[PDB]
Amino acid sequence: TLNGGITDMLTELANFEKNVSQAIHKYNAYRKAASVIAKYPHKIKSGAEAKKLPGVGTKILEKIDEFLATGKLRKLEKIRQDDTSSSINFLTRVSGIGPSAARKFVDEGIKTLEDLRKNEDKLNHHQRIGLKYFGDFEKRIPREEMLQMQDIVLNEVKKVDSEYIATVCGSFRRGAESSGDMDVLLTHPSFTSESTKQPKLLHQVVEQLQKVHFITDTLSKGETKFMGVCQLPSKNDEKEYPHRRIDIRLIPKDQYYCGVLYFTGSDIFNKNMRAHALEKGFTINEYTIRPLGVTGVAGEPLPVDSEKDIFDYIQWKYREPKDRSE
DNA sequence: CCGACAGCGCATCAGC
DNA sequence: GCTGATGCGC
DNA sequence: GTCGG
Ligand SMILES: Cc1cn([C@H]2C[C@H](O)[C@@H](COP(=O)(O)OP(=O)(O)C(Cl)(Cl)P(=O)(O)O)O2)c(=O)[nH]c1=O
Ligand SMILES: [Cl-]
Ligand SMILES: [Cl-]
Ligand SMILES: [Mg+2]
Ligand code: NA
Ligand code: NA
Ligand code: NA
Missing domain, CATH: 1.10.150.20 (5' to 3' exonuclease, C-terminal subdomain)
Incomplete structure (x- = not known):
């Protein structure tokens, strides 16, 4: 909110490049610039001042100068008119x-x-x-609603099999006062990187949430990722809650820490962290962190027993979820 | 200058 | 049907 | 669009 005018402008530029230009690298560059400026703890007084941040170059500096002088951007004014x-x-x-x-x-x-x-x-x-x-x-979803949704999901998962562990990730795990959807990480000891002792592990959970009328619609579904729609139950004579997006990700239990780091995000935080891993000679996905050889080929998974282990490998001090909202 | 920019599940389609 | 590329959304 | 080498 400190530089909300500038970051809104950059987000709108990012959306234009993604949606209209189909220019994915410009989209990610604008989003990175908006992220670094949203994080900057001073009210930006000039483009030159913003250019000092990593990800703000000459072009965005000039746009910031126009925006500060006039309160708008002619480029965006024409886009809105098109x-x-x-x-x-x-x-x-x-x-x-x-x-x-x-x-x-x-x-x-x-x-x-x-x-x-x-x-x-x-x-x-x-x-x-x-x-x-x-x-x-x-x-948006108020955090109080996220808490009720969590209670339903964890309890219904417990009813299917007490050995499931469901973890709400996303902005909720980062402590946000509201979220755009609900992201649920799921594990079960039967499903590891070594073996799948039990089929339909995800299906059984989805089926149970549909049975109690929490999950109402499916957007896509496979053996490890469900994306769909859910709704809190309302009380008598009460207006219904909005329908909400829900994503469930079944991750091998021995890869929980890479999975929970991934699903907690933010997406820009993950991009920054994964980029930094590459610079340190590692690659990170939602399953493993692996070293890269001289060929740049990913080696074998390194041992991981905490989220902090992943940070340690790439020589980053640990960042709590609430400081990953980039 | 310019190559790289994080990484992947699921849905859909083309070609065989 | 399988495989590979593309779209979309995390 | 930006940047490290
Ligand atoms: C989209 C995306 C996601 N994630 C990871 C990191 C993400 O945190 C995780 C969940 O994706 P979600 O799109 O739900 O992002 P939230 O953080 O929850 C959010 Cl603030 Cl946008 P909201 O949903 O509360 O509105 O998946 C990625 O790693 N890369 C991506 O491109
Ligand atoms: Cl591009
Ligand atoms: Cl992997
Ligand atoms: Mg989310
Ligand atoms: Na810069
Ligand atoms: Na999501
Ligand atoms: Na869309």
Whole structure:
């Protein structure tokens, strides 16, 4: 909020490059610049001052100078006025419509919420459910609701098998006062990097959450990742809660710490951390941290017994979840 | 200058 | 059907 | 769009 004007401008530029230009590197550059400026503990007085931060170069410095002098950016003012860019940007707000489908729909005259509704047969399943809950999926989730959702998910998982461990990650684990969705890390001792003693480990949990009418819709589902929709139950005569996005990730139990580091994020934090790992000669994914040889080929998984072990390998002081909101 | 930019599950489609 | 590329979203 | 080498 200290530099909220600038970071909003950069986020809108990032969205334009991703959604309209399909220029993924410009998208990530703008997001990195917005992240470093959001973290900067001073009210930026000039582009030159912002250029000192890593990820802000000459181009963004000049945009910041325009924004500070005038309160706006002509480039963005023209983008807002362009019907084609505005239409593509809007459609990507539906879950499952990305930049390519958005431009395909616009090209064939499908430009608004009603166009989508009257053309539901042009949508795949994910897009159909994203359209159905368009308004709901724009709402934030109060942390008090996240706590009730956690209670349901952990207890229903416990009812399936007491040896499951479900961990709510995402912004919730970083202590945020509100979240965009619910991310659940799941483990069971039957599923390790060495063996899967039991099938349908994820299915059984999903099935149970559907049975109690917590999970209401499916966006995608495989043996280790479920992405879908859920809803808190409401009380008598009470308006319903919005439907909410939920993601469940089943990770081999012996890879919990890499999985919980990954699912806790933020996404930019993970990108920064994984980039730094590469510079230190390691690669990090949600399963393992491995060394890189002189060929750059990933070696064998290093032993990991805590989140901090992962930080230790890349020579970073440990950062608590609440300081990973980048 | 310029190569690299984090890493991967699931859905869908083309080609065979 | 399988395989590989692409889209999308974490 | 930015940056390390
Ligand atoms: C999108 C994305 C995610 N994650 C990891 C890190 C992410 O933290 C984790 C969950 O993804 P989610 O999109 O739900 O991100 P949240 O942090 O929970 C959030 Cl603040 Cl955007 P909100 O959901 O509360 O609105 O997955 C990544 O590693 N890379 C990615 O590109
Ligand atoms: Cl690009
Ligand atoms: Cl791995
Ligand atoms: Mg989340
Ligand atoms: Na800089
Ligand atoms: Na979308
Ligand atoms: Na998520």
